[PDB]
């Protein structure tokens, strides 16, 4: 399991995606899930809250034309959610609250045009990591 605000952060900036514990609220509610229950580690053992669209009301994380924010569950094993998340935006930028959305600390400049040091064969670009290229010989690089 990889629920730490580090651990996702990398994650998420390498691989543009949440890990394999992640599911969206929806999802998690399909599945059984039932917020006032405080069943999600029942009826989804190993898997935290993660995904949604963070509608950023309040204006507390930075603003762009085109510019997005996701959220999902930091810290959390089981019972109700708890109050730490990890907000990223579709440019990359990595954010994480502890106070359930009141405040926020910036984690992460974007990662965007950094190539990840991950061996990957490839023919064109779209076969590497965001930030990386196809060179010559056949693998993905700065």
Same mark, same amino acid.
């Not at 952060?9 to 999802?27: C, F, R």
């Not at 059984?32 to 405080?38: L, P, Q, T």
């Given at each position: ?51 949604? %669209?963070? $509608?950023?009301?309040? /204006?507390?994380? #930075? ?6 924010? !996701?959220?999902? *569950? ?32 910036? %984690?992460? $400049?974007?990662?965007? /045009?950094?190539? #990840? ?6 023919? !064109?670009?779209? *076969? ?15």
């Amino acid at each position: 399991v990889i629920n730490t605000f580090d651990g996702v952060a990398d994650y998420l900036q390498t691989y543009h995606k949440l890990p394999d514990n992640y599911i969206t609220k929806s999802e998690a509610q399909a599945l059984g899930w039932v917020a006032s229950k405080g069943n999600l580690a029942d009826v989804a053992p190993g898997k935290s809250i993660g995904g949604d %669209i963070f $509608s950023n009301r309040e /204006g507390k994380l #930075p603003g762009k034309s085109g510019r997005t924010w !996701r959220e999902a *569950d930091i810290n959390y094993t089981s019972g109700f959610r708890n109050s730490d998340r990890i907000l990223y935006s579709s440019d990359w930028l990595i954010y994480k609250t502890t106070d359930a959305y009141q405040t926020f600390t910036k %984690i992460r $400049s974007s990662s965007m /045009g950094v190539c #990840p040091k991950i061996l990957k064969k490839c023919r !064109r670009d779209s *076969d590497c990591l965001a930030g990386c290229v196809c060179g010559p010989n056949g693998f993905c690089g700065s």
